[PDB]
Amino acid sequence: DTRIGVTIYKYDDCFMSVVRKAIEQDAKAAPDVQLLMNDSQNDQSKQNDQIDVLLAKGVKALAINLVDPAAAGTVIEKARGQNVPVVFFNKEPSRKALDSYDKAYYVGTDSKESGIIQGDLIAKHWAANQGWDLNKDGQIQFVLLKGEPGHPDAEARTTYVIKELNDKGIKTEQLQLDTAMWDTAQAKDKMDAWLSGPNANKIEVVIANNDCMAMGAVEALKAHNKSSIPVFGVDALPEALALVKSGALAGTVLNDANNQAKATFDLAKNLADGKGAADGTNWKIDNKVVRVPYVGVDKDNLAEF
Ligand SMILES: OC[C@H]1O[C@@H](O)[C@H](O)[C@@H](O)[C@@H]1O
Ligand SMILES: [Ca+2]
C-alpha cells in the first residue's frame, strides 16, 4: 500500500469540508492507496508538526492545504528532507516557492476569474434591478466581506469584482470593507455592525468573497429587516444554492470542489508511485499547476446545478 499524507487547513471551513470529503471518496477507487487525513485546526504550527509526523510514518507523497500560504517554503523544506513530492491545494504558493522544488505542484483555480464572474453577475442583476440604486446616483454603494488577508482568492476576488463592475461602466463606492476570515459568524457580526452604524441606510449591495460569509450577511440582514439588500457569494455550496432558490442570495459562483479533489488525488498518487504527475489522466498541468474553472450561478441557470 502507498501512504499519502493529507492536511486540511481546518475541517470546519465550509468549502474545504466539501473538498476533504471528495478526496476521501476518490481514495475508495484506489484500493492500493491509504490517505492519512489531518485537521490542522487553523494553526500552521499544528500543521507543521502533523507534516513531521506524516513524513516519519513514511508517506510517499503529501497533499497540503496550507493554513498560511506564506508557509509553503517551510513545508517544501520538510518534504525535501525525505525527497517526497508535495501537491499543494486551494491555498496557492508563490511562483518562487513552487519553482524552489521540482517535486512541488499546485491544484486550485484561476482566482481572478471568480472575481470577474462575480462582478459580471452583479452587473447583470444591477441592470435588471434599478430599484437597488437607493440614492439614484448610478453608482453601487457596497460593503465587502473579505477572506483571509493575503489569501490569493481573497485578494483576487476583492480586486476583480470591483474592477469588473467598473470596467463594465458601473461606478462603485466602497462604504465598508473588512475581513471575516471566510467564516459565517464573523461575517454576520461584521454585517450587523454595519447595519447598526450611522449611514447603514446607504448600503445597496453586499459582496462577499465566499458563501459562508455571504450566509452570515444574509442572517444579519434578516435580523434588521433589510433583506431587500442583495447579497453575492462564491463557492455554490449546497446551502448557498438553496438560498439562491429561496431568493435570500442573489448569486454565487461554483468553486469546483469535486474536480479539485480529483486532480489533487490523481497527481499525488502518480507522484507517490514515481510516475509523471498527469499520467493516465486528462489533467492539463501548466508549469506544475492545475486550475479548475469557476462558473457563475443564479436563478437563471440554477437548474444546471
Ligand atoms: O482556503 C479556504 C477558502 O478557499 C476558497 O477558495 C473558498 O472560496 C473559501 O470558501 C474557503 O474559505
Ligand atoms: Ca447608488
Swiss-Prot record:
It comes from the Bacteria. GO terms for molecular function: calcium ion binding; carbohydrate binding. Beta-D-galactose binds at residues 13, 90, 151, 153, 157, 210, 235, 255. One of its GO terms (cellular component) is outer membrane-bounded periplasmic space. InterPro entries: Bact_Solute-Bind_Prot2, MglB-like_PBP1, Peripla_BP_I, SBP_2_dom. Keywords: Calcium, Chemotaxis, Metal-binding, Periplasm, Signal, Sugar transport, Transport. The keyword Metal-binding applies. Pfam families: Peripla_BP_4. Its main location: periplasm. Part of the ABC transporter complex MglABC involved in galactose/methyl galactoside import. In addition, binds D-galactose and D-glucose and plays a role in the chemotaxis towards these two sugars by interacting with the Trg chemoreceptor. Chemotaxis requires MglB, but not MglA or MglC. Belongs to the bacterial solute-binding protein 2 family. The ABC transporter complex is composed of one ATP-binding protein (MglA), two transmembrane proteins (MglC) and a solute-binding protein (MglB). PANTHER family: D-GALACTOSE_METHYL-GALACTOSIDE BINDING PERIPLASMIC PROTEIN MGLB (PTHR30036:SF2), D-XYLOSE-BINDING PERIPLASMIC PROTEIN (PTHR30036). The calcium-binding site is structurally similar to that of EF-hand proteins, but is in two parts, with the last calcium ligand provided by Glu-204. This is D-galactose/methyl-galactoside binding periplasmic protein MglB. It comes from Escherichia coli (strain K12).
